[PDB]
């Protein structure tokens, strides 16, 4: 039993952060929970207001001339009767929101943006998208913003004083949905005006068409390609800056590939993962030279014990004793240090690491070989 409650449930009475956030990617990057305290200074009412305009508008450029639409409900927040969950309801019902994300958007793109902005979560399955379409067609835009917020999910996750954040929940109910939100928040330096084509489709940046890719992955349950989860991603804004030995980041697609060097690499992984299947079976019994003598070298191991440390005079000479737990076995400092150098020293781990760099290089060398007719080539 590792996790005890998910983030879709309310927090219990005995924690500060939820449990699933404590070892997730939540701790590693900027996608955290900013809370408004009880009594707010006017300087730290800006720290809650700049975080709302980050999330609810998705890194858009709110100019000064168009932030004058919001001063009526800005001040209603700065006074303190609009909570954060009620400020974002009026901000979604605004005019500058409906111009940006509604009046040129296909109905799939508007629902998946509302899933990113109001909830912290890309759309899960398809009949959830379908029922939120069926509010708007029967009740209009007005009650449809009450669908996201006036359900159990906003109250349990964000309460009424936390600004929405992209959740890194740990447990994902399909495992496809961890990439759906990873492709939707695609970059710190991105925004939905760019990703939806709403600047190139229109005139001088206005009159944009907010069209969506990945529509078919909602209907047909199909995974996201791995490039759209590792290139521009929340996993780079929350990069752990480790020393991962399979380094997960994808290399740039090279110019000048050749079908020769793909064929050596493709055969090369088949020599390695066939060897891995015949080396993982061999280990775990006969890998160890000093293991069959361990029961004999342990039976005669204890003799001439010693209480006061420093006996075994050996003819009346000093010759003391260690009596530690480690050194009673005859071990040194290099006995526990060998576990740190088994990354390449080992034979089962050297094969697996060398396999995983090869399928890394093969996944980008193959995909660069998808451009065909006017290709100028090389001599290596």
């Amino acid at each position: 039993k590792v996790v005890d409650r998910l983030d879709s449930q309310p927090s219990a009475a005995f924690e500060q952060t939820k449990q699933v956030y404590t070892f997730s990617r939540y701790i590693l990057g900027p996608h955290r929970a900013v809370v408004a305290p009880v009594a707010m200074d006017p300087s730290e009412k800006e720290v809650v207001l700049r975080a709302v305009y980050r999330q609810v508008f998705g890194n858009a450029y709110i100019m000064e001339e168009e932030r004058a639409e919001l001063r009526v409900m800005e001040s209603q927040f700065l006074l303190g009767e609009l909570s954060v969950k009620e400020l974002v309801r009026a901000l979604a019902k605004s005019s500058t929101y409906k111009v940006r994300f509604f009046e040129g958007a296909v109905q799939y793109r508007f629902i998946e943006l509302c899933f990113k902005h109001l909830l912290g979560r890309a759309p899960d399955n398809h009949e959830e998208i379908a029922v939120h379409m069926r509010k708007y067609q029967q009740e209009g835009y007005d009650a449809e913003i009450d669908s996201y917020l006036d359900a159990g999910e906003y109250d349990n996750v964000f309460g009424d004083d936390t600004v929405p954040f992209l959740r890194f929940r740990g447990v994902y109910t399909p495992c496809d949905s961890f990439n759906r939100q990873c492709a939707l928040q695609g970059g710190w330096a991105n925004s939905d005006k760019a990703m939806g084509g709403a600047a190139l489709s229109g005139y001088n940046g206005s009159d944009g068409r907010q069209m969506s890719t990945m529509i078919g992955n909602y209907i047909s349950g199909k995974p996201i390609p791995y490039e759209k989860v590792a290139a521009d991603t929340p996993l780079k804004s929350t990069a752990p800056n480790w020393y991962a030995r399979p380094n997960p980041a994808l290399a740039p697609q090279p110019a000048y590939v050749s079908a020769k060097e793909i064929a050596e690499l493709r055969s090369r992984v088949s020599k390695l993962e066939a060897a891995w299947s015949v080396a993982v079976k061999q280990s775990a019994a006969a890998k160890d030279t000093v293991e069959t003598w361990r029961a004999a070298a342990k039976e005669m191991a204890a003799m001439r014990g010693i209480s006061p440390m420093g006996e075994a005079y050996f003819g009346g000479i000093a010759q003391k004793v260690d009596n530690g737990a480690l050194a009673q076995l005859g071990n040194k400092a290099s006995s526990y240090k060998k576990y740190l150098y088994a990354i390449e020293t080992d034979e089962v781990s050297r094969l697996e690491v060398d396999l995983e760099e090869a399928k890394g290089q093969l996944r980008v060398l193959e995909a660069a070989m998808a451009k065909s007719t006017p290709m100028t080539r090389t001599a290596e």
Binding site: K1, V2, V3, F23, S24, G170, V171, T173, P174, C175, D176, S177, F178, N179, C182, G221, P223, I224, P225, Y226, V229, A230, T233, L235, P240, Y243, A244, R245, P246, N247, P248, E273, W276, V280, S283, A284, Y339, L340, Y341, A342, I343, E344, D346, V348, S349, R350, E352, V353, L355, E356, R363
Partner: protein, 177 residues
């Protein structure tokens, strides 16, 4: 998601058939062996915490570079996530053994789990090893032939249910490969 009893229904409507005495026979025998299935799913959930530590640590001893600096179970953060993705898969498998159908599994975990580990940089076939050890533990518990624990049952043949739970554990293997 679907069940066993829904599965005859989601096939019969494609012909629009009244399900009379046509194909009910695997359902009257289903509820007949309900108790000896409930006696078999209880065997896993009573031992599930000591299964996934048995299995994840067993994957480590076969590949000890996973805990050296660099490996994908090195720190306390990487170990606590891997110990959690072992718990998620064993939980959906116990759901599929509970309904007797696989469509709780491949729509709720196996869809896109292959592309996730390619993104996160988790090595594939060592994670295959950890599901493989959990397969060997489930068929031991159901047949009551684990080495170091026994539970008491009414005597009877349960080699058919142990093949069913093994038939789901390699569907996880076909996903993440």
């Amino acid at each position: 998601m679907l069940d066993a009893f829904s599965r005859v229904v989601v096939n019969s409507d494609a012909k629009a058939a009244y399900v009379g005495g046509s194909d009910l026979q695997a359902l009257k025998s289903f509820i007949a062996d309900g108790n000896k299935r409930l006696d078999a799913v209880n065997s896993i959930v009573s031992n599930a915490s000591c299964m996934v530590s048995d299995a994840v640590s067993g994957m480590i001893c076969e590949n000890p570079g996973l805990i050296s600096p660099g490996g994908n179970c090195y720190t306390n953060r990487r170990m606590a996530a891997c110990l959690r993705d072992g718990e998620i898969i064993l939980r959906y498998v116990s759901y599929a053994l509970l309904a007797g159908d696989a469509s709780v599994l491949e729509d709720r975990c196996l869809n896109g789990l292959k592309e996730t580990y390619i993104a996160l940089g988790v090595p594939t076939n060592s994670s295959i090893r950890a599901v493989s050890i959990m397969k060997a533990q489930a068929v031991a518990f159901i047949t009551n032939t684990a080495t170091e624990r026994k539970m008491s049952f009414a005597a009877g043949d349960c080699t058919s249910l142990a093949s069913e739970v093994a038939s789901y554990f390699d569907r996880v293997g076909a996903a993440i490969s």
